Amino acid sequence: SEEERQFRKLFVQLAGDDMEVSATELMNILNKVVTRHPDLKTDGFGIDTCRSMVAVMDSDTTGKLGFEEFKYLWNNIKKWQGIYKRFDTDRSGTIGSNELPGAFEAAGFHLNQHIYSMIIRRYSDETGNMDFDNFISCLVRLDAMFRAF
Amino acid sequence: SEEERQFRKLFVQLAGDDMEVSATELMNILNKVVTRHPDLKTDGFGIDTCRSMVAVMDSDTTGKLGFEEFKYLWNNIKKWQGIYKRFDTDRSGTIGSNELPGAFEAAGFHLNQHIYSMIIRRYSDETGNMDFDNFISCLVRLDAMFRAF
């Protein structure tokens, strides 16, 4: 419906002067998500993770995220946020070892030993839980990888 | 034999019209590497580091990287990426204090106290961990410094 009309207003407002979303503007919008959802355990989205997101999502290499690049990422993020909440069945405000398999499958990813050992590990705490920002960050990198073998 | 013919296609394609690889083009191919390997922690390759890398590798002063210059740098990068992964034995997606010395040795370098403390202060975080782009940038600069003398 007009939710597409809603998204265009979001993009234009967020992108500003240059019409593209930089890592800073991305950081702004992601921390707005954490602001509106205090039920999410998170230490916020740092500039480093947001620069990494842009680097792997900026496929036309403009250095920032254009309309189509931001729309793709944004819908993914909103979709993953829904998954994050849906799969946190122990109400920990995080996604743990018993929740992750289902969550990643719902996000459209198939896991393997490499992924668990080389990716998931670095994004989770000592009990295997990943907070909201790590969860989203891990998925952006995983999506960037899947879309590009 | 094969990887050679395709490296050549890689170079010509990346160099574009001026037939040499700029700092911007280097940044794009390097960000493409982290896009494909989520097992590498990174905040992407900034233009600033990619310009200093080009500056110390541009042996013939054209301001950019020609075939031979880019070939040398690129082969080093791939070798260093294999080292990064091999030596990250705690699977942090980064190279830390107990991993650095070994990794640098494999890269062909033996550092003294002065350099080691500088390296850690300039390229590693508060835990003594350096990400992928910092590791690569550090090695390019170290490589170039030692070559000179």
Coordinates of C-alpha atoms in Angstrom, one line a residue:
Chain A
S1 CA 0.0 0.0 0.0
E2 CA 1.2 3.5 0.9
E3 CA 3.8 1.9 3.2
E4 CA 5.9 2.3 0.1
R5 CA 5.0 5.9 0.2
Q6 CA 6.0 5.8 3.9
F7 CA 9.3 4.4 3.0
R8 CA 10.1 7.0 0.5
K9 CA 9.5 9.8 3.1
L10 CA 11.8 7.8 5.4
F11 CA 14.6 7.5 2.9
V12 CA 14.5 11.2 1.8
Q13 CA 14.4 12.5 5.4
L14 CA 17.2 10.2 6.5
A15 CA 19.4 10.6 3.4
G16 CA 19.5 14.4 3.5
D17 CA 21.6 16.7 1.2
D18 CA 23.2 13.9 -0.9
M19 CA 20.2 11.6 -1.4
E20 CA 22.2 8.6 -0.1
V21 CA 22.4 7.1 3.4
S22 CA 25.8 7.3 4.9
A23 CA 27.1 5.1 7.8
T24 CA 26.3 8.0 10.2
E25 CA 22.7 8.4 9.0
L26 CA 22.3 4.6 9.2
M27 CA 23.6 4.7 12.8
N28 CA 21.0 7.4 13.5
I29 CA 18.1 5.4 12.2
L30 CA 19.2 2.1 13.9
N31 CA 19.6 3.8 17.3
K32 CA 16.1 5.2 16.8
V33 CA 15.0 1.6 16.5
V34 CA 16.7 0.7 19.8
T35 CA 15.3 3.9 21.3
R36 CA 11.7 2.9 20.5
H37 CA 12.1 -0.7 21.7
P38 CA 13.6 -0.7 25.2
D39 CA 12.7 -4.4 25.4
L40 CA 15.7 -5.1 23.2
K41 CA 18.9 -5.9 25.0
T42 CA 21.6 -4.0 23.2
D43 CA 24.6 -1.7 23.6
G44 CA 23.5 0.3 20.5
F45 CA 24.9 0.4 17.0
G46 CA 28.4 1.8 16.9
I47 CA 29.9 3.7 14.0
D48 CA 32.2 0.8 13.2
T49 CA 29.4 -1.7 12.7
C50 CA 27.4 0.8 10.7
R51 CA 30.5 1.5 8.5
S52 CA 30.8 -2.3 8.0
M53 CA 27.1 -2.5 7.0
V54 CA 27.5 0.2 4.4
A55 CA 30.7 -1.3 2.9
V56 CA 29.1 -4.7 2.3
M57 CA 25.7 -3.3 1.2
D58 CA 27.0 -0.5 -1.0
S59 CA 27.2 -2.7 -4.1
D60 CA 27.3 0.2 -6.7
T61 CA 30.3 1.5 -4.7
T62 CA 29.0 5.1 -4.3
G63 CA 30.3 5.0 -0.7
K64 CA 26.8 5.4 0.7
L65 CA 23.4 3.6 0.4
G66 CA 21.1 4.7 -2.4
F67 CA 17.4 4.3 -2.5
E68 CA 17.4 0.6 -3.7
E69 CA 20.3 -0.3 -1.5
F70 CA 18.8 1.2 1.7
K71 CA 15.3 -0.2 0.9
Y72 CA 16.8 -3.7 0.6
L73 CA 18.7 -3.4 3.9
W74 CA 15.9 -1.6 5.8
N75 CA 13.2 -4.2 4.9
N76 CA 15.7 -6.9 6.0
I77 CA 16.4 -5.2 9.3
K78 CA 12.7 -4.7 10.1
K79 CA 12.1 -8.4 9.1
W80 CA 15.0 -9.5 11.3
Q81 CA 13.7 -7.5 14.2
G82 CA 10.4 -9.3 14.0
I83 CA 12.3 -12.6 14.0
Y84 CA 14.4 -11.5 16.9
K85 CA 11.4 -10.8 19.1
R86 CA 9.4 -13.8 17.8
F87 CA 12.2 -16.3 18.5
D88 CA 13.2 -15.0 21.9
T89 CA 10.9 -17.5 23.6
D90 CA 12.7 -17.4 26.9
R91 CA 12.0 -13.7 27.1
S92 CA 15.7 -12.9 27.7
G93 CA 15.7 -9.8 25.4
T94 CA 18.3 -11.7 23.4
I95 CA 18.6 -14.7 21.0
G96 CA 20.4 -17.7 22.6
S97 CA 21.7 -21.1 21.4
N98 CA 18.3 -22.8 21.5
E99 CA 16.6 -19.9 19.6
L100 CA 19.2 -19.1 16.9
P101 CA 18.7 -22.1 14.6
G102 CA 15.1 -21.4 14.1
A103 CA 15.6 -17.6 13.9
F104 CA 18.3 -17.9 11.2
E105 CA 16.1 -20.4 9.3
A106 CA 13.2 -17.9 9.4
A107 CA 15.7 -15.2 8.2
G108 CA 16.4 -17.5 5.3
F109 CA 19.8 -18.8 6.2
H110 CA 21.1 -22.4 6.4
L111 CA 23.9 -22.8 9.0
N112 CA 27.0 -25.0 9.0
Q113 CA 30.1 -25.6 11.1
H114 CA 32.0 -22.7 9.6
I115 CA 29.2 -20.3 10.3
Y116 CA 28.8 -21.4 13.9
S117 CA 32.6 -21.5 14.6
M118 CA 33.7 -18.6 12.4
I119 CA 30.7 -16.2 12.6
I120 CA 28.1 -16.8 15.3
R121 CA 30.8 -17.3 18.0
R122 CA 32.2 -13.8 17.6
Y123 CA 28.7 -12.3 17.7
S124 CA 27.6 -13.9 21.0
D125 CA 28.4 -13.7 24.7
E126 CA 29.8 -16.5 26.9
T127 CA 26.4 -18.3 27.2
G128 CA 25.8 -18.1 23.4
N129 CA 23.4 -15.2 23.5
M130 CA 23.5 -12.3 21.0
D131 CA 22.0 -9.0 21.7
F132 CA 20.0 -7.0 19.2
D133 CA 22.9 -5.1 17.5
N134 CA 25.1 -8.2 17.2
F135 CA 22.1 -10.2 15.9
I136 CA 21.4 -7.6 13.2
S137 CA 25.1 -7.0 12.4
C138 CA 25.8 -10.8 12.0
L139 CA 22.8 -11.1 9.6
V140 CA 23.8 -8.2 7.4
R141 CA 27.3 -9.7 7.0
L142 CA 25.7 -13.2 6.4
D143 CA 23.3 -11.7 3.9
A144 CA 26.1 -9.9 2.1
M145 CA 27.9 -13.3 1.9
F146 CA 24.9 -15.3 0.7
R147 CA 24.1 -12.7 -1.9
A148 CA 27.7 -13.0 -3.1
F149 CA 29.3 -16.5 -3.1
Chain B
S1 CA 48.6 -20.9 -15.1
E2 CA 44.9 -20.4 -14.7
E3 CA 44.8 -18.1 -11.6
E4 CA 47.3 -16.0 -13.6
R5 CA 45.2 -15.4 -16.7
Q6 CA 42.2 -14.5 -14.5
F7 CA 44.2 -12.2 -12.2
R8 CA 45.0 -10.3 -15.4
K9 CA 41.3 -10.0 -16.3
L10 CA 40.7 -8.9 -12.6
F11 CA 43.2 -6.1 -12.9
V12 CA 42.1 -4.8 -16.3
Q13 CA 38.5 -4.8 -15.1
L14 CA 39.2 -3.1 -11.8
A15 CA 41.6 -0.5 -13.2
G16 CA 39.0 0.9 -15.6
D17 CA 39.8 3.6 -18.2
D18 CA 43.1 5.0 -16.8
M19 CA 44.5 1.4 -16.7
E20 CA 45.8 1.7 -13.2
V21 CA 44.2 1.0 -9.8
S22 CA 43.3 4.0 -7.7
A23 CA 42.8 4.2 -4.0
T24 CA 39.1 4.2 -4.6
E25 CA 39.2 1.1 -6.8
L26 CA 41.5 -0.6 -4.2
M27 CA 38.9 0.3 -1.5
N28 CA 36.1 -1.3 -3.6
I29 CA 37.9 -4.6 -4.2
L30 CA 39.0 -4.8 -0.6
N31 CA 35.5 -4.1 0.6
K32 CA 34.3 -6.9 -1.7
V33 CA 36.7 -9.2 0.2
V34 CA 35.0 -8.5 3.6
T35 CA 31.6 -8.7 1.9
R36 CA 32.4 -12.3 1.0
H37 CA 34.0 -13.3 4.3
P38 CA 31.8 -12.6 7.4
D39 CA 34.4 -14.5 9.5
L40 CA 36.5 -11.3 9.3
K41 CA 35.7 -8.5 11.7
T42 CA 36.0 -5.1 10.0
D43 CA 34.6 -1.6 9.8
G44 CA 35.3 -1.6 6.1
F45 CA 38.3 -0.2 4.3
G46 CA 38.2 3.6 4.5
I47 CA 39.5 5.8 1.7
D48 CA 42.2 7.2 4.0
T49 CA 43.9 3.9 4.6
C50 CA 43.5 2.9 0.9
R51 CA 45.3 6.1 -0.1
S52 CA 48.3 5.5 2.2
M53 CA 48.5 1.9 0.9
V54 CA 48.6 3.2 -2.7
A55 CA 51.1 5.9 -1.7
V56 CA 53.6 3.4 -0.3
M57 CA 53.1 0.8 -3.1
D58 CA 53.2 3.2 -6.0
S59 CA 56.9 2.5 -6.7
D60 CA 56.9 4.3 -10.1
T61 CA 55.1 7.5 -8.9
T62 CA 52.2 7.4 -11.3
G63 CA 49.9 8.1 -8.3
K64 CA 48.1 4.8 -8.9
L65 CA 48.9 1.1 -9.0
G66 CA 49.9 -0.4 -12.4
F67 CA 49.7 -4.2 -13.1
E68 CA 53.0 -5.2 -11.4
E69 CA 52.4 -2.9 -8.4
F70 CA 48.8 -4.1 -7.9
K71 CA 49.8 -7.8 -8.5
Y72 CA 52.4 -7.6 -5.6
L73 CA 50.0 -5.9 -3.3
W74 CA 47.1 -8.2 -4.1
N75 CA 49.1 -11.4 -3.7
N76 CA 50.3 -10.1 -0.3
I77 CA 46.7 -9.3 0.7
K78 CA 45.5 -12.8 -0.1
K79 CA 48.4 -14.3 1.7
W80 CA 47.9 -12.1 4.7
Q81 CA 44.2 -12.9 4.7
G82 CA 45.0 -16.7 4.9
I83 CA 47.4 -15.9 7.8
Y84 CA 44.8 -13.7 9.6
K85 CA 42.3 -16.6 9.5
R86 CA 44.9 -19.3 10.4
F87 CA 46.3 -17.4 13.4
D88 CA 43.0 -16.3 14.9
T89 CA 42.9 -19.4 17.0
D90 CA 40.5 -18.1 19.5
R91 CA 38.0 -17.4 16.7
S92 CA 37.4 -13.8 17.5
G93 CA 37.4 -12.7 13.9
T94 CA 40.4 -10.6 14.9
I95 CA 44.1 -10.9 15.6
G96 CA 44.9 -10.4 19.3
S97 CA 47.9 -10.1 21.6
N98 CA 48.8 -13.8 21.8
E99 CA 48.2 -14.2 18.0
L100 CA 49.9 -11.1 16.6
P101 CA 53.6 -12.2 17.0
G102 CA 52.9 -15.5 15.3
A103 CA 50.9 -14.0 12.5
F104 CA 53.5 -11.3 11.7
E105 CA 56.2 -14.0 11.7
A106 CA 54.3 -15.9 9.1
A107 CA 54.0 -12.7 7.1
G108 CA 57.8 -12.5 7.3
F109 CA 58.3 -9.9 10.1
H110 CA 60.0 -9.9 13.4
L111 CA 59.3 -6.8 15.5
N112 CA 61.1 -5.3 18.5
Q113 CA 59.4 -3.9 21.6
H114 CA 59.2 -0.3 20.2
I115 CA 57.4 -1.3 17.1
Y116 CA 55.2 -3.9 18.7
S117 CA 53.8 -1.4 21.3
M118 CA 53.3 1.2 18.6
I119 CA 51.5 -1.3 16.3
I120 CA 49.2 -2.3 19.1
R121 CA 48.4 1.3 20.1
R122 CA 47.8 2.5 16.6
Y123 CA 46.0 -0.6 15.1
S124 CA 44.4 -2.5 17.9
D125 CA 41.4 -1.8 20.2
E126 CA 41.2 -1.6 23.9
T127 CA 41.5 -5.4 24.3
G128 CA 44.6 -5.6 22.1
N129 CA 42.6 -6.8 19.1
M130 CA 43.0 -5.7 15.6
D131 CA 40.4 -6.1 12.8
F132 CA 41.0 -7.2 9.2
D133 CA 41.4 -3.8 7.6
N134 CA 43.7 -2.6 10.4
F135 CA 45.8 -5.8 10.0
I136 CA 46.1 -5.4 6.3
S137 CA 46.9 -1.7 6.5
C138 CA 49.5 -2.3 9.2
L139 CA 51.2 -5.0 7.1
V140 CA 51.3 -3.0 3.9
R141 CA 52.9 -0.1 5.8
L142 CA 55.3 -2.5 7.7
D143 CA 56.2 -4.3 4.4
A144 CA 56.9 -0.9 2.7
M145 CA 58.9 0.4 5.7
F146 CA 61.2 -2.7 5.9
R147 CA 61.7 -2.8 2.2
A148 CA 63.0 0.8 2.4
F149 CA 66.2 1.3 4.4

